[PDB]
Write a protein that binds this ligand. Sequence first.
Ligand code: ZN
Length: 273
Amino acid sequence: PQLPEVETIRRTLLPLIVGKTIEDVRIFWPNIIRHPRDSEAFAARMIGQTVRGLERRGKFLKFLLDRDALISHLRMEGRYAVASALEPLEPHTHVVFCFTDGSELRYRDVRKFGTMHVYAKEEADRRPPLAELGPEPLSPAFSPAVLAERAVKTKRSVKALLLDQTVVAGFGNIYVDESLFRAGILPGRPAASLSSKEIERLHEEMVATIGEAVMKGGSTVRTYVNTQGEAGTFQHHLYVYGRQGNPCKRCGTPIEKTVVAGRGTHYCPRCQR
DNA sequence: GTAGACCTGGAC
DNA sequence: GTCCAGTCTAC
Ligand SMILES: [Zn+2]
C-alpha cells in the first residue's frame, strides 16, 4: 500500500474503531512489533486505552489512543479488518486488538513484512519511523522547489529519488512509474539531469496522480481493498504499471519493463525521454 | 548504487 | 520448479 491505499484504509477504518477501548492485544508473530521490542510490553501498555483518532503520515497509519500513538506500516500486504471476537480468525492474522465491546481489530499480513511501533503521542513524530519522513505530497510543504533541492544534489535515478520517503512521503512503485510516465520522463534518468521545466512537470503530475488515486480509493492490482473489502478503482487508470507488452494508451508503443533501483519498472519508450 | 534479507502464495 | 510482488542492511 502507498499513500492512496493507506488513506483509503484510514478513512474507512476510523469510524469502525473510534471510541472503542482496548481490553487485550494478542500477538502471533512477535517480529512485527518493533517498539517496544518486547511484545509483552507493547500489548500491556495499550490495554485500557481508547482509540481517539486515526491519522496518516506517508504510508503509515497513526492510531491515536489516550497516552500513546500506534504507528503501523503495512509494507507489501498488510491489512486491517474489524470483526467479532466470537468468530474464528482468518489465516495470516498476526496481531489482534480486542475491544471491550466484543469486537476486534485484526491485522493480517501474509508476508509478515509489516511493522508496529508504540510511543507516547508527543514522541511519535521525533522517533523512527516517522522522524525522517519527507513532506506530504498533497500539502504546500511539497513543492517543485523541494523536489529540485534533492534532485540537483544526487546522481541516482529519478525513480530512486521519488521512492525515497525522506524526499517526499507516500509514493511507491505504482505511483512513481505512473507519475514519471505522465511527466514524460524516463525512470532511469539521473535525477540531476532533470531541467527546471521537467521538475515542475514531475511535481505537477505527482500531485495530480496521487490525488486522483485517493479519489478512486487506491489501486487494486493484487489484493488491496479498503476496510470493507472493497477494491479501489485507480488500477483502471494506469498508463504503465503492470502493462508491459500492452500498447501505450497515448501512442500505442508497447510498454516495457526493466529493473531500475532494484524494482520492476514500467515505462513507454516513446512518451518518456 | 546494488544483490541479498524477510516471507508467502499466485502465475508461468 | 522458477519468477514476482517495501524498508532495513551489507559486499
Ligand atoms: Zn507512449
